[PDB]
Design a protein around this ligand. Sequence first.
Ligand code: HEM
Length: 214
Amino acid sequence: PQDLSEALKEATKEVHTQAENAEFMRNFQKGQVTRDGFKLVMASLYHIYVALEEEIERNKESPVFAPVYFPEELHRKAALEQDLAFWYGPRWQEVIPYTPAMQRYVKRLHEVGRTEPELLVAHAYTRYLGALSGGQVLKKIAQKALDLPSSGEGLAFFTFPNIASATKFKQLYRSRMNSLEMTPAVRQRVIEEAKTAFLLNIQLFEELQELLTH
Ligand code: HEM
């Protein structure tokens, strides 16, 4: 399509469904998520967002990313740190897993941020817009399956405190993406990078499912 935002949505519709169809995610949607499974997901998110946000900070002034730089509204690292301390305890940093599939994703994020910054928007799009769109759905399913105590911690990741209206912000974020100027060749690679992001997620889901079925 014309607008990059619409192009991305349309181009990733298929892989998004593939993600929804992933065995690990099928069970999650069926409400069959376990505490051990959720912990692995949260650990994965921590590594992914740490890498993504390190690269965003590196390229925040670049014309290829500046337009979609919203640190206060979107940063998730601090929220995940809070959540992991709850899920894995005070020594979470020493015990959280960092698996090969998580590493593959992190490696690509750093590769992009350091050598193909123009493609970082694809990763920011897939992570942030995804979390902002289906985050509520996924969160509701989680808490109603995890039967968490009432300790007031563990799911901060699912709440963006600095965004008053998700609908308003999503429109703003899409507008900024559409403001980005890139050659057709680059735009093609951004679209492809977005699909790659989903694929990295899917391979991660396959790995986590394998680790949990022993
Ligand atoms: C358990 C599986 C998942 C569910 C149930 C889910 C659910 C949703 C929902 C309800 C939407 C809103 C669609 C709309 O705006 O009308 C959405 C959008 C989106 N999701 Fe997911 N999602 C899942 C997994 C993922 C994954 C793995 C990623 C990231 C790799 C992701 C990335 C996105 C993106 C980028 C959008 C934004 C679409 C747009 O451009 O408007 N989702 N998701």
